[PDB]
Design a protein around this ligand. Structure first.
Ligand code: FES
Length: 104
């Protein structure tokens, strides 16, 4: 199965994840209470960030192309597609942005 290293605030561990199991679910089953809210791809609570490897997160409904290229992942709807190293609890890192903060 793929091996996924989850790097959390409280430590790291590496676990098996099947191709048809979402990251969040695997992590929870291995004792890691990762953040989540909606569990359906429509918020940023579960965001993680890929150090290495790939996911299938086609049901994600938050992230733009930039953000995807930066390795952001909605862990509640992400299947592994390779061995992975992922940082959890990364929502701070996602810029708020908006139409009133245009950075000049
Ligand atoms: S918990 Fe809302 S997108 Fe994952």
């Amino acid at each position: 199965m793929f091996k996924v290293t989850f790097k959390t605030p409280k430590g790291e561990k590496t676990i098996d994840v099947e191709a048809d199991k979402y990251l969040l679910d695997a992590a929870e089953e291995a004792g890691m209470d990762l953040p989540y809210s909606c569990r359906s791809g429509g918020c940023s609570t579960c965001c993680g960030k890929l150090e290495s490897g790939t996911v299938d997160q086609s049901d994600q409904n938050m992230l733009d192309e930039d953000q995807l290229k930066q390795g952001f992942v909605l862990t509640c709807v992400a299947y592994p597609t390779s061995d992975i190293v992922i940082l959890t609890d990364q929502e701070s890192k996602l810029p708020i942005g908006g139409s009133e903060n245009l950075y000049f």
